[PDB]
């Protein structure tokens, strides 16, 4: 319910489980069938996102820190500054996603204290 909730990740329906038993708190999206799985490291996550009341949807998105260690470049080896990649999980209930979101955010704020 809070540390776990069924979400859709890239149009596939599955489940989400934020677990802190683990190396820096991890979310684990495990498909409802148990086929595919996608784990998120909250510490590699810079920001977490979740639909506001103003939004017509209910969805989360965990933003991973962009790779500043080696700046990227374009086809000719110029230079580009990548926008941080993100992990979006779609929910069907704003309470659920509020529960999931609040769970992660607490972890994120936890890791920003130690960032």
């Amino acid at each position: 319910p809070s540390h776990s909730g069924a979400a859709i990740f890239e149009k596939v329906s599955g489940i989400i489980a934020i677990n802190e038993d683990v190396s820096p708190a991890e979310l684990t999206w495990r498909s409802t069938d148990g086929d595919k799985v996608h784990t998120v490291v909250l510490s590699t996550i810079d920001k977490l996102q979740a639909t506001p009341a103003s939004s017509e949807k209910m969805m989360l998105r965990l933003i991973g820190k962009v790779d500043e260690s080696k700046k990227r470049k374009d086809n000719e080896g110029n230079e580009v500054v990548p926008k941080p990649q993100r992990h979006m999980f779609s929910f069907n209930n704003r309470t659920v996603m509020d529960n999931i979101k609040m769970t992660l955010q607490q972890i994120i704020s936890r890791y920003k204290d130690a960032d």
Partner: peptide, 24 residues
């Protein structure tokens, strides 16, 4: 989005593309 026009929404488009809010 895109750029090269008046009152363009470049960069704003991708940022508002989420439709979410962060709780911090």
């Amino acid at each position: 989005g895109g750029g090269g026009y008046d009152v363009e929404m470049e960069s704003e488009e991708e940022s508002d593309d989420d439709g979410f809010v962060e709780v911090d």
